[PDB]
């Protein structure tokens, strides 16, 4: 009654028999932009079921020495399904998201993944090691797309901030002996009512193994981690020709 | 009707004092287990003193007012040092243009970066003197040059006519000048972190310096000069202090734990990654 | 709702996620001595939280050939914490007890421990083997203190009485496939309202492996048994100088 | 009040005779299991 | 509350801690024959508890290559207990049945048994292989008695009909990871109110491993399947001397 759950939206349904509740980021549900906050005057387009449905991105392999991964929203979907198309044809965009990270093992495996949502996840470089080089992250690192990227220094989240404090953000743990997934519902967060789905990532999703994976030789060693996400209340405005970036 | 298909669990409370403690006795039973939790849910423990031990009653009158974000931020702090030397490398022309950026000093910066978005008014105080702290009878002009307005190019530039821009004329011997500044962003709040790019187009390594730059935070230029057609014989140091007031903050984040390297980004010294906490020899000894 | 439990008393709390209910010896809860039964006239001292709290005694190791162990009350605590001190400074004493025996293994281990409370547990000797020697148990055997003692003939409880009938006394079983602890609440039992905590043990606690421990080679072999106890409604009277025995 | 902190499930019955036995029929169902115990 | 169950009838009781509900064939409970449907005029005999009780037949061994087994009713009991005796002494008979197939393994074994009840289970032969020989099943195959028989071509149920469609009949699955038994209550089914328990089998019980048994070397390999059945509302008429066939 708290470990079992079903998420149905659009023409997609997700099930799980070993959940650990669901988190509503900052206690707020996604919602279309009201007339008091809106500023752009054109009537928005709200595709509904064609874009607010679950999308499953590539799977990652959890190894005994994995550092962790991260994805950026809405970057991950800017080129997938009808959502991507609306994101490319419109200047303005806004929406919430239902993030469902999946990972199952056996009652003999062990390990804990911290799944968190960090809004405005700005990355930094190691500054040439010495700190005298003012280098910057490449486009491929700031917006890794659907494939996601790997963290090089998880301890400081590749941004000079302690991973030990990441729990101050909406999050769940996927502790193999307890649950096999994490679910976080994220509302739209920005200083503006709508924004470019191409030039700005509202938040990043981080999956980091704080407690390394471990198992005895002989047990299945391919332990994948899959990410399935669903836009919620997706709105679009400022229609024109398609633009990829 | 021809087509049928076409048809916050958190509230604020006023807590002026710390929670009291109710007296509790011993609990010996099954089914109920307050001590056991499931951190996986993402929730913090709800266990309280009385659930784990026998407590007495404590009428706690401890105030919670000093930790209100308002009292945490409304303390003037250094955000800029503008020097204007008479002889040397820097501007010996008697005028200086400074692009407004409050990320040049650590103390105040680390406090602001505790949050993602912040909206506020500010009180700016200008402490001016000679490099050695002495004071002389010198007349100065401070001018705010908003984005798009012509920046002065010399000590006699027409821009100093300041017919529309706001200017402050004061003597180095007067008390520090002080003025209030409103919330001026085109957006609804300033943001210390902007995970994106300012414009469209390809983002080649040649222009990667664009990453993280949000015009909504660029408030313009602060220009200063000595009032006169002739050069002044005095070196001048201007220390600018900012005091946040009428503040609102959104989305807390992990506090900076690596030294700051640059104003415009979170880059850290890769070869020397400091540990958030000091170390010891064994885990079983203090 | 019967397997999970929490025992909080004093500044101590015990938890368990695999219990098998709790036993209230003879259906009675501990209670301070009423004025009708009392005989000593001085006002008693009832320390409350400093003595009615959980105390954890040394741990024993369950081996495939262990005979069993026993402890005597209040002997086990006469030299521990503020309880011991009150027991030494006062002539008279009375109290009940909450006994919590702990022992966990894995879903692959097996074995059953009988945990019982036998009031007035008088020990006997083997009488020199032949039965012609009227020998008696040494002080170290009758009152083994906090360390507890080992049974030499569990079948007759070292007292000429059948272990097969010990279940006629307040008891619980710790059967590894079912539970990992036993809890028994014992009221004060004596022919007098108060008594010397030094010269008289009101009852003995027996932990006996009726079904031997067993597991396959490779599984953890160190299976400890820990005893945690808490005095309840401890009263003391007849104050004077401290006396250890 | 200045200091707040300072503030048998068995009965006899008369059973002169052995319990009677009530007539019972067959029980075929789930959820209920009288035969299973936890010693 | 759906996995645990107790079946008590007569002087017998069956328990199970891993059931998957109970099936009432065609939604009807067994019942004695009413006066409107009856045709034979003599007063029937309804032995009650001596015949409506659980009977346990021989056990079968599930191997990695077993084809499946079948039994016929009431043939299986025509020679057991007081039921058999009544079946032999009377010409007419009718009753329902409670079928309880048992099979337990371990959380490491796997396999699925389809347990079904097929009324009027008429067997066929392979017709000499070529199909030119009009051969017929021997008495030992049509009425295998209490021992039951083995299927030679489970895919066509030894009768030219697809096993894939057997689920159209009252049935349950015994999937080792889920449950350890199957229970089906069967009402009397025939074109006549009473019939000979010797010359006519009202239905056959089929236990077929659709998903083969499997386990790693080292795990228990003797995985038995036991069949326990109980007549319900057994009636008999047309008394005379005993007749075995
Ligand atoms: C008559 C002259 O007096 N005028 C003084 C004055 C002082 C400050 C003025 O604007 C101050 C803007 C600051 C309150 C906020 C600057 N911000 C907004 C967020 N931001 C920033 C910096 C680096 N990265 C992200 C954001 C900033 O640096 C304008 C005029
Ligand atoms: Cl001028």
Automatic annotation (TrEMBL), chains A, C, E:
Protease 3C: Major viral protease that mediates proteolytic processing of the polyprotein. Cleaves host EIF5B, contributing to host translation shutoff. Cleaves also host PABPC1, contributing to host translation shutoff. This is Genome polyprotein. Transmembrane segments: none annotated. Interacts with protein 3CD. Interacts with capsid protein VP1 and capsid protein VP3 to form heterotrimeric protomers. It is found in: Host cytoplasmic vesicle membrane; Host nucleus; Virion. The chain holds residues 79 to 323 of 2193 of the full protein. Belongs to the picornaviruses polyprotein family.
From TrEMBL, chain B:
It is found in: Host cytoplasmic vesicle membrane; Host nucleus; Virion. Protease 3C: Major viral protease that mediates proteolytic processing of the polyprotein. Cleaves host EIF5B, contributing to host translation shutoff. Cleaves also host PABPC1, contributing to host translation shutoff. Protein 2B: Plays an essential role in the virus replication cycle by acting as a viroporin. Creates a pore in the host reticulum endoplasmic and as a consequence releases Ca2+ in the cytoplasm of infected cell. In turn, high levels of cytoplasmic calcium may trigger membrane trafficking and transport of viral ER-associated proteins to viroplasms, sites of viral genome replication. Belongs to the picornaviruses polyprotein family. Interacts with protein 3CD. Interacts with capsid protein VP1 and capsid protein VP3 to form heterotrimeric protomers. This is Genome polyprotein. It comes from Coxsackievirus A16. The lineage of its organism: Viruses, Riboviria, Orthornavirae, Pisuviricota, Pisoniviricetes. The chain holds residues 567 to 862 of 2193 of the full protein.
Automatic annotation (TrEMBL), chain D:
It comes from Coxsackievirus A16. It is found in: Host cytoplasmic vesicle membrane; Host nucleus; Virion. Belongs to the picornaviruses polyprotein family. It comes from the Viruses. The chain holds residues 567 to 615 of 2193 of the full protein. Interacts with protein 3CD. This is Genome polyprotein. Protease 3C: Major viral protease that mediates proteolytic processing of the polyprotein. Cleaves host EIF5B, contributing to host translation shutoff. Cleaves also host PABPC1, contributing to host translation shutoff. Protein 2B: Plays an essential role in the virus replication cycle by acting as a viroporin. Creates a pore in the host reticulum endoplasmic and as a consequence releases Ca2+ in the cytoplasm of infected cell. In turn, high levels of cytoplasmic calcium may trigger membrane trafficking and transport of viral ER-associated proteins to viroplasms, sites of viral genome replication.
